[PDB]
Point group: C4
Chain length 197, copies 4
């Protein structure tokens, strides 16, 4: 069947590409390991480009069904109301991180925020000699950069394979200003996290 059969073929080209510039065995394995994870988690199907078919209301509906877990697992996302969920659901970008991979490095100027569906990460100091926290499902990170209007306060490494939902700075900012009650909670956590650290 179709991309049963098309997703098996994009790795055929990518692997060929990896051999021709002779990519290190370690990196090649990472890439193959990523695509194996992609094919079994999402079936490597462009949820990007089949939702593109649908009109707003039907994409909204589908998105809220396939991505229902994260609203659920995150205490801040539930009790937020239907309003909030509809407003943010189409802006939560699913992203996969391999074990040991760096999501955020302390000192960077990014302000994207990440929500943990599946997996766990570690929050580290800049020299990586200190571990401040392990974070897992229902918890989020990357919020302090925008709220404290500062560079990344810490380094965040995936401890395992991670299903994360990335929320861009603009939407994050837009959402923060549109929901003060939720914004107050995130702001307080951020200060709580920085009068720690």
């Amino acid at each position: 069947d179709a991309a049963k059969l098309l997703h098996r073929e994009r790795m055929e080209r990518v692997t060929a590409f990896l051999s021709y510039k002779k990519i290190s065995p370690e990196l090649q394995r990472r890439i193959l390991e990523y695509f194996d994870y992609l094919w079994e988690t999402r079936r490597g199907y462009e949820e990007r480009e089949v939702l593109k078919e649908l009109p707003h209301p039907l994409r909204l509906a589908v998105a809220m069904e396939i991505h229902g877990d994260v609203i659920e697992k995150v205490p801040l996302f539930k009790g937020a109301g239907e309003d909030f969920i509809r407003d943010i659901i189409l802006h939560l970008e699913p992203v996969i991180y391999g074990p040991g991979e760096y999501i955020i490095r302390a000192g960077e100027l990014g302000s994207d925020v990440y929500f943990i569906n599946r997996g766990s990460v570690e929050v580290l100091s800049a020299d990586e000699k200190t571990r401040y926290a392990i974070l897992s499902e229902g918890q989020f990170f990357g919020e302090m950069a925008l709220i404290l209007r500062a560079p990344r306060t810490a380094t965040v490494r995936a401890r395992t394979f991670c299903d994360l939902y990335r929320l861009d700075k603009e939407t994050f900012d837009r959402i923060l200003s549109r929901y003060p009650e939720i914004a107050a909670q995130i702001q307080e956590l951020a200060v709580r996290r920085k009068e720690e650290l």
Copy 2:
């Protein structure tokens, strides 16, 4: 023949996608019902991407032929003149809404305006305990947000399948300022509608 035969195949992939993440029977039926409506109303043909072939004047001409109904059915669109019709016709985006679907929710920050070619909608209060109006062909909604410079003053639900023409905020604003006489009429309706409600 061609997309007689290509439009039958994009539903083959989308349906497969719906089964793999196990989308609810109700949502799956909505999607299939939408595409059946798409295939019989537009023959599911990319009027998007065949007009893309043509130069401005020929796209202008084709658009004014295939989308002649809405200029006609809307009293404000006729007597407006050739000037106005040419200026707006390529900015009226055809959009389909299924019965019972929410086009607008009271309190949202959108300013898109919708023109009803075919079908009917209901204008509701925020708690949906009050029905202010049923709107059908020749009538429009979604204009009060920009004119009153406010969030959506009401909720608008499709009562049936609807062929709507969406006009984006920027073009709506551009059109309003470019035609004061038409703008005066819309402004007056908006105030009339808000000293009701």
Copy 3:
């Protein structure tokens, strides 16, 4: 051979599209007449998407070869120097207008300027009861809108099939400010044309 054989097939879809929404015989003939002109003038080949293959210097070189006529036919374009020609050549968009078609209508807010490679046009008053000029190869129009910072001062209709080169407002403005000597000439013509009219 290839798009010998692909350009014959895009008209197969477009014609089918024209029959399904039953486009007027007159408009259908215009469209077919346009594509016949396209296939014999350019061989309907995407000079758009084969130049896309090439690096800047080679696209620059090819553009200056295939589009050498207009630099030549326009007195203002020659003696301008290599500097000027290189700076503008990749911004002159080839556009085709059928006989009798409206390129510009008096009162519109566009500021695109057009250069006549092949064909002739007529410059008309707003009510089209007055003909101010016939313009042909080496001559240009659509410059007065930006220079007089005004709406289109007149209506311009193609008298024949026309090969025009469209120069967008931003590039036109950028070019005007970058070459004062050429700008002075265009400015003077524009005032000369408006203390006529």
Copy 4:
């Protein structure tokens, strides 16, 4: 195999295109010579569109492997640290210039900077009667326009085939402000180069 077999076919269309508008023998040879160089240097493979498959961390990793030479050959790029390399690596665009081709012309308003992986160039005065320098691997040019906030101070011609890495003005500016120590060095070279010349 695949684009072993697809890259042989894009030249089939481009060559056909070159014959139909009868491109000069000299330009046709340049284009064929470019694509022969493309097919043997990169195997004409879209490193553009296979990296597009990968998530950020894996594209970052691959980019730093395939494009490791330039960080190495350029004294300013080494000792800069991992921070700097990660920040810039995905912004260094590989570009190929044929022998004798003009990369930069004195007086132009561009501010793109170029890093020489392979090949050599010559830095010339505006009238091209003076040769200020030959530049090769590990050296860069095109930095003075932004730093002196001026038009191109000189003309730069490829003496041979060149593998260059282009860094756009915005990223160049962003990088300059983000790393003052490296910025100081480039600024000093630019002044040193202009109190020469």
